[PDB]
Design a protein around this ligand. Structure first.
Ligand SMILES: CCCCCCCCCCCCCCCCCC(=O)OC[C@H](COP(=O)([O-])OCC(O)COP(=O)([O-])OC[C@@H](COC(=O)CCCCCCCCCCCCCCCCC)OC(=O)CCCCCCCCCCCCCCCCC)OC(=O)CCCCCCCCCCCCCCCCC
Ligand SMILES: CCCCCCCCCCCCCCCCCC(=O)OC[C@H](COP(=O)([O-])OCC(O)COP(=O)([O-])OC[C@@H](COC(=O)CCCCCCCCCCCCCCCCC)OC(=O)CCCCCCCCCCCCCCCCC)OC(=O)CCCCCCCCCCCCCCCCC
Ligand SMILES: CCCCCCCCCCCCCCCCCC(=O)OC[C@H](COP(=O)([O-])OCC(O)COP(=O)([O-])OC[C@@H](COC(=O)CCCCCCCCCCCCCCCCC)OC(=O)CCCCCCCCCCCCCCCCC)OC(=O)CCCCCCCCCCCCCCCCC
Ligand SMILES: CCCCCCCCCCCCCCCCCC(=O)O[C@@H](COC(=O)CCCCCCCCCCCCCCC)COP(=O)(O)OC[C@H](O)CO
Ligand SMILES: CCCCCCCCCCCCCCCCCCCC(=O)O[C@H](COC(=O)CCCCCCCCCCCCCC)COP(=O)(O)OCCN
Ligand SMILES: CCCCCCCCCCCCCCCCCCCC(=O)O[C@H](COC(=O)CCCCCCCCCCCCCC)COP(=O)(O)OCCN
Ligand SMILES: CCCCCCCCCCCCCCCCCCCC(=O)O[C@H](COC(=O)CCCCCCCCCCCCCC)COP(=O)(O)OCCN
Ligand SMILES: CCCCCCCCCCCCCCCCCCCC(=O)O[C@H](COC(=O)CCCCCCCCCCCCCC)COP(=O)(O)OCCN
Ligand SMILES: CCCCCCCCCCCCCCCCCCCC(=O)O[C@H](COC(=O)CCCCCCCCCCCCCC)COP(=O)(O)OCCN
Lengths: 76, 78, 105, 157, 387, 54, 71, 85, 218, 116
């Protein structure tokens, strides 16, 4: 259920295990209360999964590159 | 009350037609629930006057499935 | 703004979403027979199977392949039983219905 | 990558085409084309064995049963109100809203994903099926047993 | 080491031996199979773990098997029991899907197989409609499981996609407005499968819900739909099969009110009393006891149905679910009218009960007379018992 | 006729293979635009919280 | 079995050399990408060149040279 | 559990036998061995229910005290008791 | 206890108000957050924005009833009418659209009249709901024979009154209701104090109106 | 990036049901075979096997006599219940050998040179 398709484990299995270890070591009587204290590991696991923030950074660099070529077309 | 011939013609009215199978109604109900019932998720937090008036509005505009008939069943053009 | 792999992935997901809703709705919408309804159910199963295999490749994970094999098994068993029931009902009701396998008429 | 993306997009066209036509034979032919094309799509993702399973089961076995049932049970009634009654506009509206515009997509808030090819290992699949998911394997066998017994009990005598 | 899995190997070995024994018995031309049924009941006891819910399901299925006579029907009921038992232990959507689909296929095949007389084609028709409606719900479950699996990367059942899985579960309980497959099934399929369908799968699915399910949503509109639609439908339908189908929709609305306000103890108490009443309802030969089912399904005070409804009402009032409670009380006031129609039909009438001619003389008087003693269970129900 | 049906199928396949990528491209462009708006709003909130949070 | 065991041993010998070569090439490509980003975003206020997204674990690229579509 | 649960079970068994006779058209006293078997089963069933009463109270107090709900010793005897009320 | 002379609880009352009862060792609530659309929909200070926030939900009911009636009309269509797809689409969309627009109109009239009387009277009470119900029901009942132009304002006002009593006034009156721990104003009876309110995994229609009633979540 | 060189000839040592415990008793054998499980089985296990077989024989004789097939029904029902009991007893013995159940009787009998 966490077994890899061509490798031993999945590519983001260890990030998931970090998150579950954080959830294991908290002592709050509710899962919803424990989740508020492990949000950094859940965020890193989601970044392993889909890379939304790396894609966002590349989109911002592309917006600046498209801005420095339309507004700026300076000839020598 | 009334006349026997006129009452029996009233009893016969709008039933001279083959009844449809129920598979279409059931499939359309399941499609409506599985596709659009998530639109009511935030409605549980709305004010209760709005929810009660909406429930009364749904009751007032409901059309009953049993003994239902349309004039469109027996006309040859729109 | 986006790469060729992102076009490929978004095209796959858009295709499978339209496949799923085509299989769910279309044969009922076009008022077709029970045989075509079972074929469209197979289209629904194919869309889910393609989604599971895409995700299994996407995560490098085995669970999508297990689900793929299971979906093929369950879909074929349900389809075979449904076709047998269709044949039995047709032979039971053809003397008075003619269009017996069409319940959307 | 024009032909690969076109082959991906062809599956949705064939999915609509299965229900669009009035001939049951042509519906089955569209389904066979769809399953062959999808087996070639699955092999873009790196799956060699599972694409062959798709072909062998659905086209090789199940569509033969479909064609036997259609050819045994379908006297031509395409004129007999299959053309003269048309289709449902409410159902077409539901299909447009949910599958063209896709107001409730499976990716949810995300709108872009990077497609990644895999590398199928059948040793990993054999290990998983016969060690880690062995109870699911046996329960799949029990479902196939239900299918075999139930068909032979329901066969019209 | 596989030493912790001997019950699974025992399940498989028992199935392998039972098929061969059933084959050998049929090669002799035996027209009755009580020995096969006893071996099936022994196999049911031998594969069930030592929990309360597991043994409740086991004893229920042992009692149900006395109304089935062919070898194939017994095999289908055993393989449906495997899905019903293992769904209570399912902690994923993989096993959830497989158990639900095994149960659906078994029910479809049994509906096809057991019909007789002029009602054969009606039963096959309703089985086909149920199969088609079940296929698309299974597709919805698979599609949204694939969505959840892609989003989370794991097999955890969290997030927005659990709303559609919840709708799948509500379909399997016949919750209005997805209720009409059960209404179609009640009108044509014979009484033994109707008895099977109203008891065992509801227990299995509610135990899965109690054991391994959380969602961040509500089911209140389906509570309202089930209670109002079931009560008004049972008030308006003159056929008795449709009366009991709509009254079942009303009861599942009450069970959903118990689920929605938490407090599963009232859910389990009402479900147990309902299951015992169902076991009485579908095995009745004397029609005077049809009035006891009526007074104990209307919630009338000294009988056990009152207690099952009244803890649901008490826990709903405890957490202040006022609007759903008011709707439940209105529909309870409506339900009394058609249960009184039942009492008018079968109590204020001359008594006629035909004798048996080909043996088997009134063959389920033991179970029906034992289940009528739901007038003595209320002494244990008033105590803190079900928690 | 057979030639008409083959021509209609070929036309439908080519039209689907040219028209749908524009739908997908428009959808992806809308997602990119909304994501960039979300990034700018997040940066604005971060600057505000740095301004009154020390 | 003897042939497979020999090939597995040789692959175990060669694997760290190849992973090291991959690592050095990846580092050089990252250096070129950071130079390009610094050339593009020099005038943007508040932008930091080289901001890693995750906090603890290194993130490999999603795509790789060895996984290609068959057809 | 309840002190008079076995007598209630015996009355349940007698009513069971009488109803099994009435359903099959026999008078109430016919087949008294059916009444006797029903009485034995009813006695043991209601004694088992009365045992589950004490068991449920013990489970509730044990779970509540492990969660941190400290019950005073004047009230722990309401739960951790095989009370024959 | 019981005598024919008098009823002692009718004259045995407290002489002072009580202090607040401590029910648990932790006195902070736990709950899931409300979505912002419903938070905005509660605001009545802008009558127009209140009607705009509330009317689409009441229009959803007419959409559901219209879709029902449209399917039931479509099923009865003969083939000579059903194959004409543009005419079929305009008939069914006419039925659905008329129902949706009528429901949205009734909802907007109710919400605007409610918030207008609210802002005009300067206070929140049950009069604004009764007046809004009378106006909306008179709009529904116009043009009909005569029990109805009186009967429909009464029905819509009764729906408003039931909404106030069940959904607002009774939860406000029972904010100090406790099912656990010490009996309120009877702490001398000695019922023990739990470490927390009870954790219940209830649905979204059953949420704690006070932080001390229960903890909601999982 | 560069994957691990796969070992085709080594399968993982995994049983599909995992116990999620550590043993709380001394471990005699972490992995006993069927001979080890039978040769350290207690007498109560054999007693419940024989009781199940006898009950199966009697009940099978009762039910098989209605179709005049009583002896083979009795034999089959006896074997069916007896193998259920035997699997139960072997599992109990193996769990005592592995340390998950109390094995004071088993530690003083299965270690002839490690007796005391
Ligand atoms: C998209 C694709 C399109 C697919 C469309 C599918 C339609 C298929 C047809 C169908 O469903 O068949 C009808 C089908 C008929 O049901 P059935 O199973 O055949 O029979 C059940 C009953 O027997 C019903 O029997 P009947 O229909 O033959 O009628 C008998 C009649 C008999 O009625 C009676 O006799 C009882 C009447 C009692 C009082 C009578 C009045 C007397 C008063 C005295 C006069 C004084 C004046 C007072 C004025 C009024 C004040 C009260 O009963 C009624 O009229 C009452 C039924 C109403 C149910 C209400 C439950 C809803 C929730 C509860 C809250 C609201 C309830 C109101 C209370 C609140 C008020 C504050 O109805 C349903 O299954 C219900 C679902 C349909 C509605 C919604 C459709 C879904 C489509 C969604 C649209 C798009 C999405 C938007 C919404 C988001 C997701 C939800
Ligand atoms: C290792 C596991 C061993 C097997 C355990 C599961 C198999 C149970 C099947 C069974 O009792 O077969 C009935 C069978 C009687 O069937 P039959 O006399 O051939 O059929 C006559 C007609 O059914 C007409 O006679 P009837 O309807 O008056 O009697 C039907 C039958 C049973 O009738 C019923 O199903 C109704 C009884 C309701 C009581 C349910 C108890 C659950 C209470 C839950 C408490 C927790 O009667 C009994 O109460 C016999 C009970 C014998 C001991 C059961 C243990 O009992 C036996 O022969 C003895 C079986 C006991 C083990 C051998
Ligand atoms: C020294 C003293 C002598 C001993 C006297 C014993 C009394 C006579 C019993 C007659 C007999 O064994 O055969 C009758 C009869 C068979 O004779 P038959 O009239 O030719 O058969 C009629 C049909 O052909 C039946 O055909 P079949 O042969 O296929 O019938 C098989 C029969 C089984 O019979 C046999 O196969 C042989 C019977 C045992 C023989 C060995 C015993 C000695 O099926 C049953 O299992 C009958 C089920 C009836 C109910 C049993 C208990 C159900 C418990 C479930 C709970 C329900 C109540 C709970 C309350 C609800 C709470 C919520 O067997 C039964 O009905 C057995 C019922 C139970 C017998 C045990 C009685 C013990 C209780 C004490 C009796 C107190 C009265 C004492 C009399 C003396 C002073 C007045
Ligand atoms: C007429 C029927 C009579 C039945 C009873 C008599 C027959 C004997 C019973 C069968 C053998 C005993 C039961 C299983 C023994 C397992 C104990 C064990 O460790 O044995 C071997 C364990 O190997 C097996 O044979 C494992 C059996 C696997 C069975 C897998 C399927 C289980 C059932 C799944 C069903 C799923 C659930 C279905 C419903 C959802 C290996 O022994 P070892 O570890 O000492 O040897 C080490 C060596 O290098 C090899 O490992
Ligand atoms: C004499 C009857 C006629 C003969 C015919 C027999 C019919 C077949 C057998 C009965 C079928 C109906 C049973 C329905 C299921 C009810 C029991 C479900 C379990 C339940 O309620 O929960 C347990 C309470 O048990 C309890 O003690 C529940 C009390 C009993 C509930 C039923 C009330 C009506 C009688 C608590 O479980 P836990 O806290 O131990 O679980 C924690 C570990 N997961
Ligand atoms: C419905 C069943 C009752 C039938 C008769 C109802 C008559 C109306 C209630 C009159 C109560 C008196 C009253 O107005 O006082 C209210 C006290 O709040 C409250 O505490 C409101 C409680 C009133 C309803 C209690 C009845 C519940 C019976 C069981 C219902 C079923 C379960 C619950 C859904 C609010 O005073 P005001 O706003 O006029 O004061 C104006 C200054 N602020
Ligand atoms: C159909 C009528 C809808 C309508 O005009 O509603 C207005 C806007 O609400 C809406 O229609 C809100 C929905 C807007 C699109 C989402 C508010 O109506 P009003 O407050 O002007 O009504 C004054 C009557 N007395
Ligand atoms: C005439 C009838 C014919 C049929 C017409 C069909 C209607 C059109 C189809 C639906 C179109 C609207 C649905 C999409 C709304 C998107 C809202 C913004 C999305 C967003 O980012 O916020 C979300 C919260 O919004 C939410 O919670 C959105 C809830 C909206 C509910 C659906 C729309 C209202 C119901 C339909 C209209 C009825 C009107 C009747 C006149 C998720 O938040 P996140 O932080 O996770 O987002 C993560 C990404 N940044
Ligand atoms: C007789 C008694 C009253 C019968 C009708 C009651 C109607 C209101 C029910 C109600 O407010 O309860 C809600 C249940 O969810 C709901 O009932 C959600 C309804 C959402 C609005 C639906 C608008 C039309 C949608 C399309 C048609 C579907 C059918 C609609 C009838 C949530 O209660 P709360 O959280 O405010 O309770 C707070 C106190 N604990």
């Amino acid at each position: 259920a966490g077994m890899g398709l061509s490798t031993g484990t999945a590519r983001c299995y260890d990030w998931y295990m970090d998150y579950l270890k954080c959830m294991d070591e908290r002592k709050e009587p509710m899962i919803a209360l424990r989740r508020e204290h492990c949000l950094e590991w859940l965020e890193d696991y989601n970044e392993c999964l889909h890379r939304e923030k790396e894609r966002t950074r590349r989109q911002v660099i592309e917006r600046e590159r498209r801005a420095q070529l339309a507004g700026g077309s300076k000839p020598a | 009350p009334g006349n026997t011939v006129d009452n029996w013609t009233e009893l016969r009215a709008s039933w001279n037609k083959e009844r449809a199978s129920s598979l279409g109604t059931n499939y359309y109900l399941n499609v409506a629930v599985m596709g659009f019932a998530y639109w009511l998720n935030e409605a549980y937090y709305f004010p209760p006057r709005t929810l009660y008036v909406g429930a009364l509005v749904f009751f007032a505009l409901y059309v009953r499935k049993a003994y239902f008939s349309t004039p469109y069943a027996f006309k040859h053009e729109y | 703004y986006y790469t060729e792999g992102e076009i490929f992935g978004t095209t796959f997901m858009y295709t499978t979403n339209m496949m799923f809703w085509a299989g769910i709705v279309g044969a009922v919408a076009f008022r077709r027979n029970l045989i075509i309804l079972l074929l469209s159910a197979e289209t629904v199963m194919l869309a889910c199977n393609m989604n599971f295999l895409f995700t299994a490749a996407y995560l490098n994970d085995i669970t999508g392949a297990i689900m793929s094999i299971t979906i093929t098994t369950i879909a074929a068993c349900e389809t075979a039983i449904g076709l047998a029931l269709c044949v039995a009902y047709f032979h039971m009701r053809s003397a008075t219905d003619v269009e017996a396998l069409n319940m959307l008429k | 990558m024009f032909f690969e993306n076109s082959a991906i997009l062809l599956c949705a066209l064939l999915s609509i085409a299965v229900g669009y036509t009035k001939s049951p034979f042509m519906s089955l032919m569209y389904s066979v084309m769809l399953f062959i094309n999808s087996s070639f799509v699955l092999m873009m993702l790196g799956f060699e064995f599972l694409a062959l399973v798709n072909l062998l089961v659905y086209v090789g076995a199940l569509a033969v049963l479909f064609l036997f049932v259609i050819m045994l049970l379908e006297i031509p009634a395409t004129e007999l109100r299959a053309y003269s009654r048309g289709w449902s506009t409410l159902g077409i509206f539901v299909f447009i809203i949910n599958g063209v515009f896709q107001i409730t997509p499976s990716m949810g808030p995300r709108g872009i994903i990077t497609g990644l090819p895999g590398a199928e290992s059948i040793t990993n699949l054999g290990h998983a099926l016969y060690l880690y998911f062995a109870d699911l394997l046996i329960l799949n066998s029990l479902v196939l047993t239900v299918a075999l017994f139930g068909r032979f009990a329901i066969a019209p005598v | 080491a596989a030493a912790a899995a001997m019950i699974e190997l025992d399940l498989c070995f028992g199935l392998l031996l039972l098929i061969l024994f059933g084959l050998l018995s049929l090669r002799n031309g035996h027209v009755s199979l009580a020995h096969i049924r006893f071996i099936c009941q022994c196999w049911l006891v031998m594969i069930t773990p030592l929990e309360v819910q597991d043994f409740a399901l086991c004893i229920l299925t042992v009692v149900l098997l006395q109304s089935f006579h062919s070898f194939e029907a017994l095999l289908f009921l055993l393989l449906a029991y495997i899905g019903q038992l293992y769904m209570m232990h399912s902690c994923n959507l993989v096993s959830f899907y497989v158990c639900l689909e095994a149960q659906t296929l078994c029910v479809v095949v049994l509906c096809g197989l057991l019909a007789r007389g002029a009602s054969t084609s009606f039963s096959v028709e309703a089985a086909l409609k149920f199969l088609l409606l079940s296929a698309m719900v299974s597709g919805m479950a698979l599609f949204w499981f694939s969505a959840m699996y892609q989003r989370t990367g794991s097999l955890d059942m969290v997030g927005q996609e659990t709303f559609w899985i919840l709708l799948v579960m509500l379909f399997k309980l016949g919750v209005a407005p997805m209720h009409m497959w059960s209404v179609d099934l009640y009108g044509s399929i014979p009484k033994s499968l109707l008895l099977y369908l109203s008891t065992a799968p509801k227990l299995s699915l509610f135990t899965f819900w109690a054991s391994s399910w959380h969602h961040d949503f509500s089911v209140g509109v389906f509570i309202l739909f089930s209670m109002f639609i079931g009560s008004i439908g049972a008030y308006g339908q003159p056929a008795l099969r449709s009366l009991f189908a709509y009254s079942t929709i009303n009861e599942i609305g009450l069970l959903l009110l118990a689920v929605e306000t938490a407090g599963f103890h009232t859910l389990y108490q009402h479900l147990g009393i309902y299951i015992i009443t169902q076991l009485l309802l579908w095995n009745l030969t004397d029609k005077r006891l049809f009035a006891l089912c009526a007074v104990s399904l209307a919630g009338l005070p000294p009988f056990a149905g009152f207690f099952g409804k009244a803890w649901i009402f008490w826990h709903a009032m405890s957490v202040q679910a006022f609007s759903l409670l008011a709707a439940a009380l209105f529909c309870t006031l409506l339900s009394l009218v058609y249960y009184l129609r039942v009492i008018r039909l079968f109590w204020t009438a001359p008594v006629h009960t035909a004798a048996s001619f080909t043996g088997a003389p009134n063959q389920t008087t033991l179970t029906s007379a034992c289940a009528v003693a739901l007038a003595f269970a209320p002494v244990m129900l008033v105590k803190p018992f079900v928690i | 006729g057979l030639i008409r049906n083959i021509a209609t199928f070929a036309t439908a396949v080519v039209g689907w293979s040219v028209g749908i990528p524009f739908v997908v491209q428009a959808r992806m462009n809308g997602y990119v635009e909304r994501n960039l708006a979300t990034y700018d709003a997040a940066q604005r909130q971060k600057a505000e919280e740095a301004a009154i949070g020390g | 079995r003897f042939e497979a065991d020999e090939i597995l041993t040789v692959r175990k010998i060669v694997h760290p050399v190849l992973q090291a070569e991959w690592d050095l090439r990846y580092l050089e490509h990252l250096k070129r990408e950071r130079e390009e980003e610094a050339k593009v975003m020099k005038n943007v206020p508040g932008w930091k060149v080289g901001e890693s997204t995750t906090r603890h674990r290194w993130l490999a690229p999603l795509e790789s040279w060895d996984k290609r579509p068959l057809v | 559990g309840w002190a008079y649960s076995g007598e209630w079970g015996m009355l349940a068994g007698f009513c069971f036998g009488t109803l099994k006779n009435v359903q099959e058209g026999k008078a109430w006293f016919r087949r008294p061995y059916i009444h006797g078997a029903g009485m034995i089963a009813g006695y043991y069933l209601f004694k088992a229910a009365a045992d589950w009463e004490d068991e449920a109270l013990k489970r509730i107090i044990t779970r509540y005290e492990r969660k941190g709900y400290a019950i005073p010793e004047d009230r722990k005897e309401l739960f951790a008791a095989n009370q024959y009320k | 206890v019981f005598s024919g002379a008098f009823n002692t609880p009718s004259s045995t009352t407290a002489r002072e108000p009580y202090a607040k009862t401590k029910s648990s060792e932790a006195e902070y609530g736990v709950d899931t957050p409300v979505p912002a659309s419903a938070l905005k929909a509660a605001d009545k200070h802008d009558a127009l924005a209140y009607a705009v926030a509330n009317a689409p939900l009441i229009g959803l009911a007419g959409l559901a009833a219209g879709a029902q009636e449209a399917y039931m009309t479509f099923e009865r269509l003969p083939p000579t009418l059903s194959r004409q797809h543009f005419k079929q689409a305009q008939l069914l969309l006419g039925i659905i659209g008329k129902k949706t627009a009528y429901a949205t109109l009734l909802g907007a009239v109710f919400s605007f009249t409610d918030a207008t009387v609210e802002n005009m009277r300067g206070k929140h009470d049950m009069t604004s709901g009764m007046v809004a119900g009378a106006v909306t029901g008179f709009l529904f009942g116009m043009g009909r024979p005569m029990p109805q132009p009186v009967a429909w304002p009464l029905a819509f006002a009764g729906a408003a009154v039931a909404a106030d009593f069940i959904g607002e006034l009774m939860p406000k009156y029972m904010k100090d209701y406790r099912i656990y721990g010490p009996v309120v104003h009877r702490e001398n009876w000695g019922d023990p104090v739990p470490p927390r309110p009870p954790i219940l995994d209830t649905g979204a229609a059953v949420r704690p109106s006070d932080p001390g009633q229960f903890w909601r979540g999982y | 990036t560069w994957p691990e060189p796969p070992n085709y000839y080594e399968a993982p040592k995994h049983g599909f049901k995992v116990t999620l415990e550590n043993p709380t008793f001394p471990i005699i054998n972490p992995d006993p075979n069927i001979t080890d499980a039978v040769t350290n089985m207690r007498s109560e296990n054999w007693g419940v096997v024989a009781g199940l077989a006898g009950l199966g024989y009697v009940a099978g004789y009762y039910f098989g006599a209605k179709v005049h097939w009583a002896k083979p029904t009795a034999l089959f029902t006896s074997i069916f219940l007896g193998k259920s009991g035997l699997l139960w007893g072997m599992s109990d013995s193996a769990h005592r050998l592995m340390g998950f159940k109390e094995n004071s009787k088993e530690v003083a009998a299965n270690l002839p040179h490690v007796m005391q």
